Amino acid sequence: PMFIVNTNVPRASVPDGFLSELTQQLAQATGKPPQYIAVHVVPDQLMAFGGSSEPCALCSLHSIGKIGGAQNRSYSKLLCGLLAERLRISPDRVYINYYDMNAANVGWNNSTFA
Amino acid sequence: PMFIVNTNVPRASVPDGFLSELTQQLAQATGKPPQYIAVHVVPDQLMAFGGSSEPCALCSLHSIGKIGGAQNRSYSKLLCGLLAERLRISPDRVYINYYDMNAANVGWNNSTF
Amino acid sequence: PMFIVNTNVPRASVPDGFLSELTQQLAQATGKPPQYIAVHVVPDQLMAFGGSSEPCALCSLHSIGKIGGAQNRSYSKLLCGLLAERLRISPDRVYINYYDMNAANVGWNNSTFA
């Protein structure tokens, strides 16, 4: 599972430890070992949401399985909460795209996960 | 709907109100209110198109529905037109990936659609 | 075909010619003229892989066709190979998401490829 956050919050507003927190929390939420989890945060972005440049985020969570109606609702509560607490972004200014990847469509270690 | 542009055009070349035009231009085409449109522009990128570092863009438009053959054609003419007009990028140096998102696969405001 | 690499390796560590090498190698690997190939490298990223900030990459390869189990394994060997050789990223610290795009879902030159 791979989590990417793109935001207009500045770099200095991203707390030390945020990447590890995401890692740990996603390992709890996906039930995957943290060794398999990748996280990526992109601050200082030129973005708008509803026409406004107030703090906002555009995110993606890719996983091989563990994607679904209820699961995605749970992930959205978790990740919006983290973005709200740590980056001071309102949950109604976050979008998170979920992608259920086929194992054959994820490369790693000179091959794929098929 | 969410539109993302990545481009090698420099930041200084992105004019005032660019994000704002995108958002308005986009509300119209999709049948969505501006309130909900998200836009993202990423200048100063290290990219090539056709092996050339002349101005170019790689973009994504995500929507829950309102994606299809004719619609994507129309969006393409719209967005290529703006990128050409505002960022001086030739239309034949732009790629736009369209994604029809399932509502259950879009999160927002602690839940999904 | 479109290849994107997001990495925490710094800009100065991306060697001269890398965008051209990627373009050339993907032309050979996909069977597609170089004029159709787009490449994008994003250094200096705030990333973690497996709860570590050692060099890593998160990548995507989009193609209209030319995507599948054996092809993707081949692409992963090639692309991890380049990332290890040129950017000193270990292949087990790379993910590559593969996307088989429908022609009607790729815009270009005021229209789509459909």
Residue numbers in the entry:
A (entry chain A), C (entry chain C): 1 to 114
B (entry chain B): 1 to 113
Paper text:
Macrophage migration inhibitory factor (MIF) is expressed at high levels in various inflammatory diseases and cancer.
1 occupies the bottom half of the catalytic pocket, whereas 2 occupies the upper half. In fact, the solvent‐exposed ring structure of ISO‐1 and 2 are well overlaid. In contrast, MIF:ISO‐1, MIF:1 and MIF:2 show relatively increased B‐factors (>10 Å2, >30 Å2, and >25 Å2 respectively) for the L2 loop. The displacements are 1.1 Å for 1, 0.6 Å for 4‐IPP, 0.6 Å for 2 and 0.5 Å for ISO‐1 and 0.2 Å for 12.
